[PDB]
Protein backbone atom coordinates (compact mmCIF):
# COMPACT_ATOMS: atom_id res chain seq x y z
CA UNK A 1 0.00 0.00 0.00
CA UNK A 2 1.05 3.60 0.68
CA UNK A 3 2.19 4.97 4.04
CA UNK A 4 1.84 8.63 5.04
CA UNK A 5 3.06 10.64 8.04
CA UNK A 6 0.55 10.71 10.88
CA UNK A 7 1.17 14.22 12.26
CA UNK A 8 2.88 17.05 10.37
CA UNK A 9 3.50 20.51 11.84
CA UNK A 10 4.18 23.74 9.98
CA UNK A 11 4.72 27.37 10.89
CA UNK A 12 2.58 29.98 9.08
CA UNK A 13 4.65 31.17 6.13
CA UNK A 14 7.06 28.24 5.82
CA UNK A 15 6.68 25.14 3.64
CA UNK A 16 6.25 21.48 4.60
CA UNK A 17 6.46 18.27 2.59
CA UNK A 18 4.59 14.97 2.73
CA UNK A 19 5.96 11.48 2.09
CA UNK A 20 4.14 8.82 0.05
CA UNK A 21 6.58 5.92 0.43
CA UNK A 22 6.69 2.63 -1.46
CA UNK A 23 5.81 0.08 1.26
CA UNK A 24 6.14 -2.95 -1.04
CA UNK A 25 5.28 -0.90 -4.11
CA UNK A 26 3.38 -3.16 -6.48
CA UNK A 27 2.46 0.09 -8.26
CA UNK A 28 5.30 -0.58 -10.70
CA UNK A 29 6.69 2.59 -12.27
CA UNK A 30 4.47 4.84 -10.09
CA UNK A 31 3.43 7.00 -13.03
CA UNK A 32 0.30 8.77 -11.75
CA UNK A 33 -0.24 10.00 -8.19
CA UNK A 34 -3.12 12.23 -7.06
CA UNK A 35 -3.37 14.15 -3.78
CA UNK A 36 -6.68 15.01 -2.13
CA UNK A 37 -7.79 17.37 0.63
CA UNK A 38 -10.60 16.54 3.08
CA UNK A 39 -11.56 19.10 5.69
CA UNK A 40 -13.43 17.82 8.78
CA UNK A 41 -17.10 17.77 7.81
CA UNK A 42 -16.76 18.03 4.02
CA UNK A 43 -15.95 15.87 0.99
CA UNK A 44 -12.41 15.25 -0.33
CA UNK A 45 -11.58 17.48 -3.30
CA UNK A 46 -8.71 16.93 -5.72
CA UNK A 47 -5.82 19.36 -5.24
CA UNK A 48 -3.08 18.02 -7.54
CA UNK A 49 -3.08 15.12 -10.01
CA UNK A 50 -0.17 14.17 -12.28
CA UNK A 51 2.26 16.06 -10.04
CA UNK A 52 4.11 17.31 -13.12
CA UNK A 53 0.90 19.32 -13.72
CA UNK A 54 -1.88 20.88 -11.65
CA UNK A 55 -5.65 21.00 -12.19
CA UNK A 56 -7.66 24.14 -12.81
CA UNK A 57 -8.88 26.13 -9.82
CA UNK A 58 -5.85 25.36 -7.62
CA UNK A 59 -3.35 28.09 -6.76
CA UNK A 60 0.41 27.76 -7.22
CA UNK A 61 0.81 27.04 -3.48
CA UNK A 62 0.22 23.33 -4.12
CA UNK A 63 2.95 21.46 -6.00
CA UNK A 64 4.36 17.95 -6.09
CA UNK A 65 6.99 15.69 -7.60
CA UNK A 66 8.46 12.19 -7.34
CA UNK A 67 12.26 11.95 -7.26
CA UNK A 68 12.69 8.16 -7.38
CA UNK A 69 9.75 6.25 -5.87
CA UNK A 70 8.22 8.60 -3.25
CA UNK A 71 5.66 11.28 -4.09
CA UNK A 72 5.96 14.50 -2.09
CA UNK A 73 3.47 17.36 -1.68
CA UNK A 74 5.18 20.76 -1.36
CA UNK A 75 2.74 23.28 0.16
CA UNK A 76 4.23 26.76 0.47
CA UNK A 77 2.64 29.70 2.25
CA UNK A 78 0.66 28.00 4.99
CA UNK A 79 -2.51 29.69 6.25
CA UNK A 80 -5.20 29.05 8.85
CA UNK A 81 -7.52 27.46 6.27
CA UNK A 82 -5.13 24.63 5.40
CA UNK A 83 -5.41 22.13 8.30
CA UNK A 84 -6.89 19.15 6.46
CA UNK A 85 -6.10 15.50 5.80
CA UNK A 86 -4.20 14.66 2.61
CA UNK A 87 -4.19 11.33 0.77
CA UNK A 88 -1.91 10.08 -2.01
CA UNK A 89 -3.55 7.62 -4.41
CA UNK A 90 -2.15 5.58 -7.30
CA UNK A 91 -3.08 2.64 -9.56
CA UNK A 92 -1.91 -0.76 -8.32
CA UNK A 93 -1.90 -4.00 -10.30
CA UNK A 94 -5.44 -4.97 -9.26
CA UNK A 95 -6.96 -2.02 -7.35
CA UNK A 96 -6.68 1.72 -6.63
CA UNK A 97 -4.97 2.28 -3.28
CA UNK A 98 -5.62 5.51 -1.38
CA UNK A 99 -2.85 5.26 1.21
CA UNK A 100 -3.00 6.54 4.77
CA UNK A 101 -3.75 9.92 6.27
CA UNK A 102 -1.77 13.10 6.94
CA UNK A 103 -3.03 15.62 9.49
CA UNK A 104 -1.58 19.13 9.27
CA UNK A 105 -1.43 21.17 12.50
CA UNK A 106 -0.55 24.82 11.87
CA UNK A 107 0.57 26.31 15.19
CA UNK A 108 1.14 29.99 15.95
CA UNK A 109 -2.31 31.17 17.03
CA UNK A 110 -3.40 32.95 20.23
CA UNK A 111 -5.04 30.72 22.82
CA UNK A 112 -8.76 31.49 22.80
CA UNK A 113 -11.08 31.32 25.81
CA UNK A 114 -14.30 29.24 25.84
CA UNK A 115 -17.54 31.09 26.54
CA UNK A 116 -20.00 29.40 28.90
CA UNK A 117 -23.67 29.33 27.84
CA UNK A 118 -26.06 27.55 30.23
CA UNK A 119 -29.36 27.55 28.37
CA UNK A 120 -32.27 27.17 30.82
CA UNK A 121 -34.63 24.32 29.94
CA UNK A 122 -38.04 25.37 28.67
CA UNK A 123 -41.19 24.47 30.59
CA UNK A 124 -42.12 21.72 28.13
CA UNK A 125 -39.78 18.80 28.90
CA UNK A 126 -39.93 19.21 32.69
CA UNK A 127 -43.60 18.19 32.66
CA UNK A 128 -42.54 15.00 30.81
CA UNK A 129 -39.57 14.32 33.14
CA UNK A 130 -36.79 15.01 30.63
CA UNK A 131 -34.43 17.42 32.42
CA UNK A 132 -31.58 17.78 29.90
CA UNK A 133 -29.84 21.04 30.82
CA UNK A 134 -27.02 21.99 28.44
CA UNK A 135 -23.84 24.01 29.00
CA UNK A 136 -22.66 24.11 25.37
CA UNK A 137 -19.27 25.82 25.15
CA UNK A 138 -17.07 26.42 22.10
CA UNK A 139 -14.52 28.82 20.57
CA UNK A 140 -11.27 27.58 22.09
CA UNK A 141 -7.98 26.87 20.32
CA UNK A 142 -6.28 24.12 22.43
CA UNK A 143 -9.19 21.67 22.43
CA UNK A 144 -8.80 20.17 25.92
CA UNK A 145 -11.69 21.13 28.22
CA UNK A 146 -13.29 19.53 31.27
CA UNK A 147 -16.72 20.71 32.42
CA UNK A 148 -17.48 20.66 36.16
CA UNK A 149 -21.28 20.39 36.28
CA UNK A 150 -22.21 20.62 39.96
CA UNK A 151 -25.07 22.06 42.01
CA UNK A 152 -22.75 23.07 44.86
CA UNK A 153 -21.62 19.46 45.25
CA UNK A 154 -19.13 16.96 43.82
CA UNK A 155 -18.48 17.95 40.18
CA UNK A 156 -19.47 15.21 37.73
CA UNK A 157 -19.88 15.05 33.95
CA UNK A 158 -21.63 11.74 33.09
CA UNK A 159 -21.55 11.91 29.30
CA UNK A 160 -20.03 15.34 28.63
CA UNK A 161 -16.90 13.72 27.15
CA UNK A 162 -17.46 13.61 23.38
CA UNK A 163 -14.12 14.40 21.63
CA UNK A 164 -15.51 16.70 18.94
CA UNK A 165 -12.83 18.63 16.99
CA UNK A 166 -15.34 20.74 15.03
CA UNK A 167 -12.87 22.55 12.77
CA UNK A 168 -15.29 25.24 11.62
CA UNK A 169 -14.46 28.41 9.68
CA UNK A 170 -12.73 30.13 12.61
CA UNK A 171 -10.53 27.01 13.06
CA UNK A 172 -11.38 26.84 16.78
CA UNK A 173 -12.10 23.56 18.56
CA UNK A 174 -15.65 23.35 19.90
CA UNK A 175 -17.16 21.23 22.68
CA UNK A 176 -20.50 19.63 23.56
CA UNK A 177 -21.91 19.52 27.10
CA UNK A 178 -24.79 17.17 27.95
CA UNK A 179 -26.06 16.62 31.48
CA UNK A 180 -27.63 13.49 32.99
CA UNK A 181 -29.90 15.52 35.30
CA UNK A 182 -32.31 13.20 37.09
CA UNK A 183 -35.91 14.25 36.33
CA UNK A 184 -36.86 13.73 39.99
CA UNK A 185 -33.83 15.53 41.45
CA UNK A 186 -34.49 18.72 39.46
CA UNK A 187 -36.41 20.24 42.39
CA UNK A 188 -33.53 19.69 44.82
CA UNK A 189 -31.00 21.32 42.49
CA UNK A 190 -31.10 25.09 43.05
CA UNK A 191 -29.61 26.18 39.72
CA UNK A 192 -26.94 23.58 38.77
CA UNK A 193 -24.13 26.02 38.02
CA UNK A 194 -21.69 25.17 35.22
CA UNK A 195 -17.91 25.59 35.39
CA UNK A 196 -15.54 24.77 32.52
CA UNK A 197 -11.79 24.30 32.89
CA UNK A 198 -9.50 25.13 29.96
CA UNK A 199 -5.92 24.24 29.06
CA UNK A 200 -3.31 26.46 30.67
CA UNK A 201 -5.92 28.69 32.32
CA UNK A 202 -7.38 25.96 34.51
CA UNK A 203 -9.25 28.54 36.60
Amino acid sequence: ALTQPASVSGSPGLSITISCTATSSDVGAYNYVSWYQQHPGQAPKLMIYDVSKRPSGVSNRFSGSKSANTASLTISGLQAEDEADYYCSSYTTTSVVFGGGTKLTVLGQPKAAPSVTLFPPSSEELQANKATLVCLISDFYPGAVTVAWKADSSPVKAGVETTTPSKQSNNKYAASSYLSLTPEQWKSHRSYSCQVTHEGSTV
Binding site: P55, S95, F119, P120, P121, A174, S176
Partner: protein, 223 residues
Protein backbone atom coordinates in the same frame (compact mmCIF):
# COMPACT_ATOMS: atom_id res chain seq x y z
CA UNK B 1 -20.47 21.59 -13.62
CA UNK B 2 -20.24 17.98 -12.44
CA UNK B 3 -22.80 17.39 -9.67
CA UNK B 4 -22.52 13.99 -7.96
CA UNK B 5 -25.39 13.47 -5.52
CA UNK B 6 -26.15 10.26 -3.62
CA UNK B 7 -29.44 8.83 -2.37
CA UNK B 8 -30.96 5.65 -0.97
CA UNK B 9 -31.94 4.52 2.53
CA UNK B 10 -29.19 5.32 5.02
CA UNK B 11 -30.64 3.02 7.69
CA UNK B 12 -31.51 -0.60 6.86
CA UNK B 13 -31.67 -4.00 8.51
CA UNK B 14 -28.37 -5.88 8.95
CA UNK B 15 -27.36 -8.70 6.60
CA UNK B 16 -29.22 -7.27 3.60
CA UNK B 17 -28.49 -5.75 0.18
CA UNK B 18 -27.87 -2.01 -0.07
CA UNK B 19 -29.24 0.08 -2.93
CA UNK B 20 -27.05 3.18 -2.71
CA UNK B 21 -27.41 5.19 -5.93
CA UNK B 22 -25.37 8.00 -7.48
CA UNK B 23 -27.28 10.45 -9.68
CA UNK B 24 -24.76 12.21 -11.92
CA UNK B 25 -25.59 15.32 -13.94
CA UNK B 26 -23.51 17.64 -16.11
CA UNK B 27 -21.69 15.12 -18.33
CA UNK B 28 -22.14 12.00 -20.45
CA UNK B 29 -20.85 8.61 -19.30
CA UNK B 30 -20.20 7.53 -22.91
CA UNK B 31 -17.07 9.69 -23.12
CA UNK B 32 -13.88 7.68 -23.87
CA UNK B 33 -11.99 7.23 -20.61
CA UNK B 34 -14.82 8.27 -18.28
CA UNK B 35 -16.43 6.36 -15.44
CA UNK B 36 -17.96 6.54 -11.96
CA UNK B 37 -16.58 4.64 -8.97
CA UNK B 38 -17.15 4.27 -5.23
CA UNK B 39 -14.92 5.11 -2.26
CA UNK B 40 -15.43 4.12 1.38
CA UNK B 41 -14.31 6.25 4.33
CA UNK B 42 -14.71 4.74 7.80
CA UNK B 43 -15.01 7.20 10.70
CA UNK B 44 -11.48 7.98 11.83
CA UNK B 45 -9.74 6.02 9.05
CA UNK B 46 -8.52 6.51 5.48
CA UNK B 47 -10.10 6.09 2.06
CA UNK B 48 -10.45 2.75 0.29
CA UNK B 49 -11.63 1.86 -3.21
CA UNK B 50 -14.55 -0.55 -3.61
CA UNK B 51 -15.83 -0.54 -7.20
CA UNK B 52 -15.50 1.34 -10.48
CA UNK B 53 -17.34 1.27 -13.81
CA UNK B 54 -16.20 2.45 -17.23
CA UNK B 55 -17.64 3.66 -20.55
CA UNK B 56 -17.60 0.17 -22.12
CA UNK B 57 -19.71 -1.74 -19.56
CA UNK B 58 -16.55 -2.82 -17.70
CA UNK B 59 -17.22 -3.55 -14.02
CA UNK B 60 -14.04 -3.40 -11.94
CA UNK B 61 -14.26 -4.31 -8.25
CA UNK B 62 -11.87 -4.58 -5.33
CA UNK B 63 -9.88 -7.84 -5.26
CA UNK B 64 -10.76 -8.39 -1.60
CA UNK B 65 -14.54 -8.07 -2.08
CA UNK B 66 -15.86 -9.70 -5.26
CA UNK B 67 -18.80 -11.85 -4.09
CA UNK B 68 -20.96 -8.91 -2.95
CA UNK B 69 -19.95 -5.79 -4.91
CA UNK B 70 -22.16 -5.58 -8.01
CA UNK B 71 -22.30 -2.23 -9.84
CA UNK B 72 -24.52 -1.37 -12.79
CA UNK B 73 -25.04 1.59 -15.12
CA UNK B 74 -28.34 3.28 -16.01
CA UNK B 75 -27.20 5.99 -18.42
CA UNK B 76 -30.71 5.91 -19.91
CA UNK B 77 -31.75 7.88 -16.81
CA UNK B 78 -28.24 8.87 -15.63
CA UNK B 79 -28.28 7.09 -12.26
CA UNK B 80 -25.40 4.85 -11.19
CA UNK B 81 -26.58 2.21 -8.71
CA UNK B 82 -24.37 0.11 -6.43
CA UNK B 83 -25.48 -3.09 -4.71
CA UNK B 84 -23.58 -4.98 -2.00
CA UNK B 85 -24.62 -8.04 0.00
CA UNK B 86 -23.59 -9.55 3.35
CA UNK B 87 -23.78 -6.35 5.38
CA UNK B 88 -21.67 -6.68 8.53
CA UNK B 89 -21.29 -4.13 11.39
CA UNK B 90 -17.85 -3.12 10.11
CA UNK B 91 -18.93 -1.44 6.87
CA UNK B 92 -20.53 1.57 8.61
CA UNK B 93 -18.97 4.50 6.74
CA UNK B 94 -19.67 7.50 4.53
CA UNK B 95 -19.72 6.39 0.89
CA UNK B 96 -18.60 8.63 -1.97
CA UNK B 97 -19.05 8.23 -5.72
CA UNK B 98 -16.47 10.13 -7.78
CA UNK B 99 -16.09 10.46 -11.54
CA UNK B 100 -12.91 9.09 -13.13
CA UNK B 101 -12.30 11.42 -16.07
CA UNK B 102 -9.05 9.73 -17.11
CA UNK B 103 -6.13 7.74 -15.73
CA UNK B 104 -4.13 10.82 -14.73
CA UNK B 105 -7.10 12.57 -13.04
CA UNK B 106 -7.94 9.99 -10.36
CA UNK B 107 -11.40 10.95 -9.05
CA UNK B 108 -11.27 14.70 -9.60
CA UNK B 109 -14.89 15.52 -8.69
CA UNK B 110 -16.37 13.81 -5.63
CA UNK B 111 -19.83 13.62 -4.10
CA UNK B 112 -21.09 14.82 -0.72
CA UNK B 113 -21.30 11.72 1.47
CA UNK B 114 -24.02 9.46 2.88
CA UNK B 115 -23.34 7.75 6.20
CA UNK B 116 -24.73 4.21 6.47
CA UNK B 117 -24.79 3.22 10.14
CA UNK B 118 -26.25 -0.29 10.34
CA UNK B 119 -25.06 -2.55 13.15
CA UNK B 120 -27.99 -3.52 15.38
CA UNK B 121 -30.41 -0.65 15.96
CA UNK B 122 -33.44 0.56 14.02
CA UNK B 123 -34.86 4.06 13.71
CA UNK B 124 -35.90 6.09 16.76
CA UNK B 125 -38.38 8.93 17.11
CA UNK B 126 -36.70 12.31 17.62
CA UNK B 127 -37.94 14.50 20.48
CA UNK B 128 -37.90 18.17 19.45
CA UNK B 129 -37.98 20.63 22.37
CA UNK B 130 -36.36 24.04 21.78
CA UNK B 131 -34.51 25.67 24.68
CA UNK B 132 -36.30 28.85 25.73
CA UNK B 133 -33.99 31.94 25.70
CA UNK B 134 -34.88 33.13 29.20
CA UNK B 135 -33.34 36.05 31.11
CA UNK B 136 -30.25 33.92 31.83
CA UNK B 137 -29.32 33.69 28.15
CA UNK B 138 -30.51 37.26 27.51
CA UNK B 139 -28.47 38.92 30.26
CA UNK B 140 -25.59 36.54 29.52
CA UNK B 141 -24.89 38.17 26.17
CA UNK B 142 -26.40 36.40 23.17
CA UNK B 143 -29.73 34.67 23.90
CA UNK B 144 -28.84 31.55 21.91
CA UNK B 145 -31.87 29.29 21.41
CA UNK B 146 -31.42 25.68 20.34
CA UNK B 147 -33.72 22.76 19.63
CA UNK B 148 -32.99 19.69 21.76
CA UNK B 149 -33.60 16.95 19.14
CA UNK B 150 -32.48 13.72 20.80
CA UNK B 151 -33.22 9.99 21.03
CA UNK B 152 -32.29 9.08 17.46
CA UNK B 153 -29.89 6.40 16.22
CA UNK B 154 -29.23 7.63 12.63
CA UNK B 155 -26.44 10.21 12.63
CA UNK B 156 -27.15 12.23 9.43
CA UNK B 157 -29.68 14.94 10.32
CA UNK B 158 -29.57 18.60 9.28
CA UNK B 159 -31.02 21.60 11.13
CA UNK B 160 -31.41 25.26 10.16
CA UNK B 161 -33.20 28.01 12.07
CA UNK B 162 -35.71 29.72 9.75
CA UNK B 163 -34.69 27.74 6.67
CA UNK B 164 -34.09 29.74 3.52
CA UNK B 165 -32.74 32.76 5.39
CA UNK B 166 -30.25 33.20 8.24
CA UNK B 167 -27.59 30.88 6.85
CA UNK B 168 -25.05 31.80 9.55
CA UNK B 169 -25.56 31.82 13.32
CA UNK B 170 -26.39 28.14 13.85
CA UNK B 171 -23.57 26.19 15.48
CA UNK B 172 -24.47 22.66 14.26
CA UNK B 173 -21.96 20.71 16.33
CA UNK B 174 -21.61 16.91 16.03
CA UNK B 175 -23.87 14.84 18.25
CA UNK B 176 -22.78 13.03 21.42
CA UNK B 177 -23.13 9.26 21.90
CA UNK B 178 -24.33 8.66 25.46
CA UNK B 179 -24.77 5.30 27.21
CA UNK B 180 -28.20 4.82 25.58
CA UNK B 181 -26.68 4.19 22.15
CA UNK B 182 -28.39 7.27 20.70
CA UNK B 183 -27.43 10.74 19.49
CA UNK B 184 -28.50 14.26 20.42
CA UNK B 185 -27.99 17.70 18.87
CA UNK B 186 -28.40 21.08 20.58
CA UNK B 187 -27.48 23.47 17.77
CA UNK B 188 -28.03 27.05 18.95
CA UNK B 189 -28.16 30.19 16.82
CA UNK B 190 -25.95 33.23 17.38
CA UNK B 191 -28.80 35.74 16.91
CA UNK B 192 -28.56 38.31 19.74
CA UNK B 193 -31.40 39.67 21.90
CA UNK B 194 -32.13 42.46 19.39
CA UNK B 195 -35.39 40.98 18.04
CA UNK B 196 -36.26 37.42 19.05
CA UNK B 197 -39.37 37.57 21.26
CA UNK B 198 -41.91 38.72 18.66
CA UNK B 199 -40.54 36.55 15.83
CA UNK B 200 -40.68 32.79 15.17
CA UNK B 201 -37.68 30.44 15.20
CA UNK B 202 -37.79 26.80 14.08
CA UNK B 203 -34.58 24.81 13.66
CA UNK B 204 -36.26 22.59 11.01
CA UNK B 205 -35.12 19.12 12.03
CA UNK B 206 -34.54 16.94 8.96
CA UNK B 207 -34.34 13.43 10.45
CA UNK B 208 -34.90 11.79 7.07
CA UNK B 209 -34.36 8.13 8.14
CA UNK B 210 -37.30 8.52 10.54
CA UNK B 211 -39.36 10.58 8.04
CA UNK B 212 -40.24 13.22 10.62
CA UNK B 213 -39.98 17.02 10.45
CA UNK B 214 -41.29 18.70 13.61
CA UNK B 215 -41.10 22.50 13.43
CA UNK B 216 -41.97 24.22 16.71
CA UNK B 217 -40.91 27.25 18.73
CA UNK B 218 -40.77 28.41 22.37
CA UNK B 219 -41.47 31.51 24.44
CA UNK B 220 -39.26 33.24 27.03
CA UNK B 221 -39.81 31.62 30.42
CA UNK B 222 -39.10 32.80 33.98
CA UNK B 223 -36.82 30.81 36.28
Amino acid sequence: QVTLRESGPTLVKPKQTLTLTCTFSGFSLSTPGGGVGWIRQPPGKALEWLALIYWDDDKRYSPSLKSSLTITKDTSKNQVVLTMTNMDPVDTATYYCARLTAADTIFDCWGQGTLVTVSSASTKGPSVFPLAPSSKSTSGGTAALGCLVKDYFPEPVTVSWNSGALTSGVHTFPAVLQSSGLYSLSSVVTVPSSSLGTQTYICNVNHKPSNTKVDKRVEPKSC
